[PDB]
Design an enzyme around this catalytic site. Structure first.
Site, PDB file in Angstrom:
ATOM      1  N   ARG A   1       0.842  -1.186   0.000  1.00 43.74           N
ATOM      2  CA  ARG A   1       0.000   0.000   0.000  1.00 43.74           C
ATOM      3  C   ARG A   1       0.878   1.237   0.000  1.00 43.74           C
ATOM      4  NH1 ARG A   1      -3.831   2.811   4.337  1.00 43.74           N
ATOM      5  NH2 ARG A   1      -5.678   3.172   3.027  1.00 43.74           N
TER       6      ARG A   1
ATOM      7  N   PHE B   1       1.185  10.622   1.817  1.00 38.59           N
ATOM      8  CA  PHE B   1       0.775  10.070   3.114  1.00 38.59           C
ATOM      9  C   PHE B   1       1.812   9.050   3.601  1.00 38.59           C
ATOM     10  CE2 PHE B   1      -2.611   7.194   5.275  1.00 38.59           C
ATOM     11  CZ  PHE B   1      -2.131   7.520   6.513  1.00 38.59           C
TER      12      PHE B   1
ATOM     13  N   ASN C   1      -0.996  -1.232  12.896  1.00 36.84           N
ATOM     14  CA  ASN C   1      -1.664  -2.094  13.868  1.00 36.84           C
ATOM     15  C   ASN C   1      -3.147  -2.165  13.570  1.00 36.84           C
ATOM     16  OD1 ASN C   1      -3.142  -0.050  15.403  1.00 36.84           O
ATOM     17  ND2 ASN C   1      -1.130   0.590  16.140  1.00 36.84           N
TER      18      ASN C   1
ATOM     19  N   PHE D   1       4.964   1.483   8.472  1.00 37.46           N
ATOM     20  CA  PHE D   1       4.889   2.441   7.391  1.00 37.46           C
ATOM     21  C   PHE D   1       5.940   3.525   7.538  1.00 37.46           C
ATOM     22  CE2 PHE D   1       2.566   5.574   9.886  1.00 37.46           C
ATOM     23  CZ  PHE D   1       1.954   4.806  10.852  1.00 37.46           C
TER      24      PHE D   1
ATOM     25  N   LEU E   1      -1.826  10.333  14.037  1.00 32.17           N
ATOM     26  CA  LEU E   1      -1.435   9.000  14.463  1.00 32.17           C
ATOM     27  C   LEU E   1      -0.701   8.978  15.787  1.00 32.17           C
ATOM     28  CD1 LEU E   1      -0.194   7.628  11.048  1.00 32.17           C
ATOM     29  CD2 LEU E   1      -2.496   7.425  12.084  1.00 32.17           C
TER      30      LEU E   1
ATOM     31  N   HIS F   1       0.034   4.816  17.160  1.00 32.76           N
ATOM     32  CA  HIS F   1       1.042   3.994  16.493  1.00 32.76           C
ATOM     33  C   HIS F   1       2.407   4.300  17.078  1.00 32.76           C
ATOM     34  CE1 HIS F   1      -1.711   2.654  13.299  1.00 32.76           C
ATOM     35  NE2 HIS F   1      -2.314   3.790  13.602  1.00 32.76           N
TER      36      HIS F   1
END
Length: 163
Positions: free
Chosen positions: A54, A59, A101, A112, A121, A125
Site C-alpha cells: 500500500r 501520506f 496495527n 509504514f 497518528l 502507532h
C-alpha cells in the site's frame, strides 16, 4: 549505538536504490529489535523478498506483510502480536518509521514510512525509527502509488540487513 538497517528496493525486479534507517533502540528497544531482527532474518523469517502493498502518495508507504502480501498477515519475533511499547516519539514529518496495527497492543511486522507529517497518528502507532539515507528513494517509490493505495508496479525489498 542505535542500529542502522537497509532495504534494497526493486520495482518489477529492477533495482531502484537503497534506503537506510536509524532504529531508536534507546527509546523503544523492544519495537526496534523486532524490526532489526526481521531485517537480518536471523530468526528464520523476515522482510527479505516481501512487498510494499500500500502506497498513498502524500501520506505513506506501508509494508512488512511477509506472510500474505496484502496487509492481512505478518508476525513479530515475539509471537503473532506484541504490545504498544510507548508513545514517546511523535509523527513529526517525512521519513518517520512507525508500526501499523489493528487496535491497541496488536503490533506484528507491518510498518509504514511517513511521507508527510501525520500527527493524528500520535499516541495510536509506535514510532521507532527514521530514514537516515535514501529519502530520495522513498520519494521515488511514492510515485508508484495511487489514491487508494494500489501500486502500479510491484515494489519489493530485494535485500535487507544491518549496516
Amino acid at each position: 549505538v542505535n542500529p542502522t538497517v537497509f532495504f534494497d528496493i526493486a520495482v518489477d525486479g529492477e533495482p531502484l536504490g537503497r534506503v537506510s534507517f536509524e532504529l531508536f533502540a534507546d527509546k523503544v528497544p523492544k519495537t526496534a529489535e523486532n524490526f532489526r531482527a526481521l531485517s537480518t532474518g536471523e530468526k528464520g523469517f523476515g522482510y527479505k523478498g516481501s512487498c510494499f502493498h500500500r502506497i498513498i502518495p502524500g501520506f505513506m508507504c506501508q509494508g512488512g506483510d511477509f506472510t500474505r502480501h496484502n496487509g492481512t498477515g505478518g508476525k513479530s519475533i515475539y509471537g503473532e502480536k506484541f504490545e504498544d511499547e510507548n508513545f514517546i516519539l511523535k509523527h513529526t514529518g517525512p521519513g518517520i518509521l512507525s508500526m501499523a496495527n489493528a487496535g491497541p497492543n496488536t503490533n506484528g511486522s507491518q510498518f509504514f514510512i511517513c511521507t508527510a507529517k501525520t500527527e493524528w497518528l500520535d499516541g495510536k502507532h509506535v514510532v521507532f525509527g527514521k530514514v537516515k539515507e535514501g529519502m530520495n528513494i522513498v520519494e521515488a517509490m511514492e510515485r508508484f502509488g495511487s489514491r487508494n493505495g494500489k501500486t502500479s508496479k510491484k515494489i519489493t525489498i530485494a535485500d535487507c540487513g544491518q549496516l
